[PDB]
């Protein structure tokens, strides 16, 4: 989605239809500003984002994390740290995400 606000009075953007011309508009109900549609996509629900949870480079300084001696799919190092999805869902899965002390990649262990 990545929606938009508006210059002038920085507010929320509500959409309206370009009847006579057939196309999408976005607007404001505080002033008058109006801009065409950025994308035909308007709303999403999604019933897989957030597994990578904030991974500052410093994620190699959190001593409470495990050490695996594999080798990323790019730099071919041997100092990686890991975990499971941070998506706290009793129905999630258990695949390992790895970060490398020599890049900051995101390679898994998955195979399906």
């Amino acid at each position: 989605a990545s929606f938009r606000f508006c210059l002038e009075c920085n507010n929320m953007l509500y959409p309206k239809e370009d009847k006579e011309n057939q196309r999408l508009l976005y607007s404001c109900r505080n002033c008058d500003y109006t801009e065409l549609a950025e994308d035909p996509k308007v709303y999403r629900h999604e019933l897989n984002i957030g597994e990578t949870a904030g991974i500052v480079d410093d994620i190699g300084q959190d001593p409470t994390l495990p050490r695996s001696d594999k080798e990323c799919p790019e730099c071919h190092s041997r100092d990686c740290v890991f975990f499971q999805s941070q998506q706290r869902r009793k129905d999630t899965n258990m695949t390992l995400f790895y970060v490398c002390l020599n890049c900051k990649k995101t390679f898994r262990d998955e195979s399906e």
Binding site: A53, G54, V56, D58, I59, Q61, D62, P63, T64, L65, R67, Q86
Partner: protein, 213 residues
């Protein structure tokens, strides 16, 4: 570490009455400012004027439950306060927790936080891979416990700060008779210290059915 697992009354109130381990102690109540100041002068751009997008992954910092602004690269803000405590310039009683996995900085002066003591590990060996303390400090024991702390050889870890450290059991190690045994930041003074007055008199409490102890 903080409370004895065994000593606790049967029936009625059971678990609502806890006894302290031998090593545990309670915080007392330090002052905030000598650390609020010590901060907004070492990288702490005050909350007052904040901009969420210019400062994206800005690690936010808290003081006794108040939000005193964020900080840019913290990795150092961290291993500076920690060096400040070990020399003894920010009471060994204060708690500092860095939760990278969320980008935040916990500051605790509070009065009533149970804490225990541990040996510091620090891979500080330009001669190998080790407990800051050595067999020279030992046999040296005008050398109290106040010095074992004023030299950064031991730290007071409250339950919160505990969360972000890695403790090694047997300092050393970490026969067909003995019990089969299976990043470190601290080591355990001694496991037999997780016990309080009560169990401390029990012989081989590590050989009886726990409910009996």
């Amino acid at each position: 570490g903080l409370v004895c697992p065994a000593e606790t009354p049967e029936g009625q109130a059971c678990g609502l009455v806890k006894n302290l381990s031998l090593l545990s102690g309670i915080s007392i109540g330090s002052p905030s400012e000598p650390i609020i100041n010590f901060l907004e002068e070492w990288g702490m751009e005050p909350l007052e004027d904040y901009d969420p997008a210019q400062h994206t992954k800005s690690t936010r910092i808290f003081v006794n439950g108040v939000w005193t602004g964020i900080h840019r690269d913290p990795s150092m803000l961290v291993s500076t306060m920690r060096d400040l405590r070990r020399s003894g310039a920010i009471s060994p009683e204060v708690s500092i927790i860095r939760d990278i996995r969320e980008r935040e900085f916990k500051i605790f002066t509070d009065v009533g936080r149970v804490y225990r003591p541990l040996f510091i590990v620090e891979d500080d060996e330009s001669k190998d891979n080790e407990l800051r303390i050595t067999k020279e400090h030992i046999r040296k024991i005008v050398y109290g416990w106040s010095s074992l702390v004023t030299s950064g050889v031991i730290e007071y870890v409250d339950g919160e700060e505990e969360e972000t450290i890695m403790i090694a059991m047997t300092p050393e190690d970490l026969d067909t008779a003995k019990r089969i045994k299976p990043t470190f930041t601290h080591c355990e003074i001694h496991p037999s210290m997780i016990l309080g007055v009560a169990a401390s008199i029990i012989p081989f409490p590590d050989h009886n059915q726990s409910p009996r102890n």
